[PDB]
Structure formats: structure tokens, C-alpha cells
Design a protein around this ligand. Sequence first.
Ligand SMILES: NC(=[NH2+])c1cc2cc(-c3cccc(-c4ccccc4)c3O)[nH]c2cc1Cl
Lengths: 246, 10
Amino acid sequence: IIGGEFTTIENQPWFAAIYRRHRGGSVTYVCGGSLMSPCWVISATHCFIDYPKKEDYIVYLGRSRLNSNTQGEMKFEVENLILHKDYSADTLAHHNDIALLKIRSKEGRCAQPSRTIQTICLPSMYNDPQFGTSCEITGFGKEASTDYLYPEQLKMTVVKLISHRECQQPHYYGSEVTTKMLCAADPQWKTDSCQGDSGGPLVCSLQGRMTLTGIVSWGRGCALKDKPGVYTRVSHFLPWIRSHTK
Amino acid sequence: LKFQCGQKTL
Ligand SMILES: NC(=[NH2+])c1cc2cc(-c3cccc(-c4ccccc4)c3O)[nH]c2cc1Cl
């Protein structure tokens, strides 16, 4: 996250950190995700596409730091890794960039609720907040587009949803943004999501609930003028989610 | 206790 503040998982208790193991001993961060129900975490397909071997990923819930432990955290294995059928990327956009990970602890259990582990709510069918709404994004992604390391402390920031008309302006993203995407930016192009925040949540309040409105997916640069962050429009994928989380 | 989606507790 560019700008923003440093926070603790109690402020985003549904945030999931996904890492990949390497033969050799290291573990590297891959993407963020969100807990939808006790056994399911949703993220973005592009985070797994190049290495879809589930046995090599680890998921942690209740984590405020990247490589050090947080007391209360839970470690999980990926029982099922579901990528979207129709996922495609072009020169910028990723279409149908959503993925599901069914998690299982080494003891055979799913997530358990605590002050650091909570689920986030799903929107109702094609129901979104109106443009203008301020939503928050959280993650361990880059703090500057030139950095080559991720922060150790979790960050959060607030961005506003913008209309498709504004985002599809030729000088923003044009037709690359579709109806299954949402754009969000900072009025002053000061704070934004960046590489590493990928797969994580865009949370807004809908009908009184903190709802997972988007998944961090793509953007040109990070915090660049007239280059909003583009998120997967979760409300348009509910049938697909249902199809696997029944 | 049990999950209540969208609720933070601080
Ligand atoms: N708000 C933005 N401007 C923005 C920037 C980036 C940048 C990325 C990104 C850049 C390089 C690699 C990956 C990546 C590739 C494979 C696995 C994981 C991440 C990214 O997600 N994702 C992004 C998502 C967003 Cl909204």
C-alpha cells in the first residue's frame, strides 16, 4: 500500500496472508486474501496461475506481520485451490481474477473465531455501493513502486470507488475495464494498492455491513494519476462462488 | 465466540 497507515490484524480480522514454500527452505509472500466462511478464503487467480501446485502454499490468519509471528495466528494448508475458468490477462487487465482456497489446519480444522480472526460479508447479487463511497484496502504489498521488498507490518488505506464512465475514459483505461471490474482511487492519487496487495480485499459498508466489494487485481503503476486500481467486482461472481462454497 | 461477518472487536 502506498501511503496509508500501519495497522494490526484486529482492524482487518478477515485478512489472510498466503505464502509459497520453496525447496531450499524459504517461504515467500505471494498475495493477500479474505476469509468468507470458516473453510474458505477468496483471492485472485493471477496469484496462482504460474504455479498452481496447492501443496506448496501456506495460509495464515491472525497475522499482523509478514515474516515474524503474531500470537493467535493460525496456519493452514490448501485443501482445494479453485481458479476461475475463463481467467485471462491481456496487456494490463486480468479478467475473472478471483480464486478460492479451501483451508485445513494440520489437525483437520478450519478457522476458529477470535479477536484477530473474523469472516467478511459477501454482497447480494450485483449489489454494489455507489461511486463516491470510501472503502479500505489492506495488505503487505509495496510501499513505493520502486521497492523490491514488502513491509513487515500490515498497512491499510482508504480509497473511493469511481464510476465506470470515469475509469473507461480513454486516458484512464478505456475498454480494458469491464462491467465485472470496479475502479477505486484516491482523489489526490496519493495512496493506492500495489504489487503484493494483489488478491486482498476492498471492503465498503453495504446495507449496514462491512462487505467484500472487490479483490485487488491490476493497475498501471501504483498511485499514478488517472490510473486507478482495478478490482474484481465480487457481486457479479456470486453464482460462481456459490457453485463451489455450498 | 462464533463468526459474525464484518465485525471487528477492539
Ligand atoms: N492499485 C494498483 N495500481 C495496483 C497495482 C498492482 C500491481 C500488481 C502486481 C504487480 C506485479 C506482479 C503482481 C503479481 C503477479 C503474480 C503473483 C502475485 C502478484 C501484481 O499483482 N497488482 C496490482 C494491483 C493494483 Cl489494484
